Structure 1
Amino acid sequence: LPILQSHSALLENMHIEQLARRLPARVQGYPWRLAYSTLEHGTSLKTLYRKSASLDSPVLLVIKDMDNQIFGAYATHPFRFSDHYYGTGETFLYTFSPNFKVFKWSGENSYFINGDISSLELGGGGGRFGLWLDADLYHGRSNSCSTFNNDILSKKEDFIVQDLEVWTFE
């Protein structure tokens, strides 16, 4: 279950094990390498894409809100800019509340990830996004979308980001 991380993280050691108990066997027991962190790298979505869009692997997205709640996504494909929606069925949203909760794909739509210069978003449902984040990594949104049938993930749908990271299994 437990693994080596190349650096410090937003996740506690019990959060790493709770992820390892539920992640795909394609990535279970691999060491995790840091691609991006607001704790060590420039706090913008362009800096996140500059660090993560060069990858070609499964990955983990980790976020802490200003209310100190931990949440994010695991994806089969790197989080990056795109012209269209991308990702595949093992991709899911999650939170620690304080125990781990996971929101696997519904099969309803391809909306796993979309990445734009103006925002990053995960899932979709008309007005809904499973996650949404601004270009500055400051404002967010998160609510139930038909892609994952997810909870609010952050402590509030109206929220401010405290810190954000991207990791790869390698």
Structure 2
Amino acid sequence: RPHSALLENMHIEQLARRLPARVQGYPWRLAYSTLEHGTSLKTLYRKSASLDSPVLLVIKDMDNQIFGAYATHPFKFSDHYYGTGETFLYTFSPHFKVFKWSGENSYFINGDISSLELGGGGRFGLWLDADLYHGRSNSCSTFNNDILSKKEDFIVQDLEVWAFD
């Protein structure tokens, strides 16, 4: 079993039970960490470039709340949305909750030069700036999610991207 600087053992177990069958039982491998690597979206893209695997995004904001996404595709720069229906958002605040694909649109993942976002329909379920510093979470139609953080706007304390290959 893995050790995360952000997820306690109980959180890892709750998340692992919600992963799709595609990666059930697969060991977790830490591909990008703001604690270990340069803190920037560019570094995240570069550390994701060799991944042959769906990925698990783990964010801890400056209020110590934990939330993120399971994405069917490694995070990459794009000029249109990508990802498919197994992508979901999750949060642990106030309690562990998963927001699966609603079927309403397929705006799962978009990697801009200056931001990474999941969800669409002008709200993003999850948005991170180019420094992985400012973030935002809104209810969006892709996932019909709750605001993943306390309020809409948050600050990343640290984040991790795990892979299964």
Q: For the superposition of Structure 1 and Structure 2, which TM-score range results when normalised by the shorter chain?
A: over 0.9
Deviations 1:77-98 (A, max 9, x none): 1111112100111110000125
Q: Give ranges in structure 1 of 5+ residues lacking alignment.
A: none
Q: CA deviation at 1:7?
A: 5.2
CA contact 1:65–1:160 (8 Å) conserved in 2: yes
- Inter-partner Cα distance in structure 2 for 1:157 and 1:108: 22
Deviations 1:147-169 (A, max 9, x none): 00001101221211111111101
- Inter-partner Cα distance in structure 2 for 1:126 and 1:58: 23
Q: Give ranges in structure 2 of 5+ residues lacking alignment.
A: none
CA RMSD of superposed structures (Å): 1.4
Query: SS of 2:22's equivalent?
Result: coil
Deviations 1:85-114 (A, max 9, x none): 001111100001253200000111110000
Tell me: CA distance 1:17–1:6, structure 2 relative to 1, closer, same or farther (3 Å).
closer
- Inter-partner Cα distance in structure 1 for 2:142 and 2:4: 31
CA contact 2:115–2:128 (8 Å) conserved in 1: yes
Identity of aligned residues (%): 96
Query: SS of 1:68's equivalent?
Result: coil
Query: SS of 1:26's equivalent?
Result: helix
- Inter-partner Cα distance in structure 2 for 1:6 and 1:125: 32
CA contact 1:30–1:169 (8 Å) conserved in 2: yes
Deviations 1:110-143 (A, max 9, x none): 1000001110010x44521000010011111101
Q: CA deviation at 1:8?
A: 3.4
CA contact 1:53–1:81 (8 Å) conserved in 2: no
Tell me: CA distance 1:39–1:99, structure 2 relative to 1, closer, same or farther (3 Å).
same
Query: SS of 2:12's equivalent?
Result: helix
Q: Post-superposition, which runs of at least 4 consecutive aligned residues in structure 1 deviate over 2 A?
A: 5-9, 124-127
Count of equivalent residues: 165
TM-score by length of 2: 0.94
- Inter-partner Cα distance in structure 2 for 1:25 and 1:152: 26
Tell me: CA distance 1:105–1:126, structure 2 relative to 1, closer, same or farther (3 Å).
closer
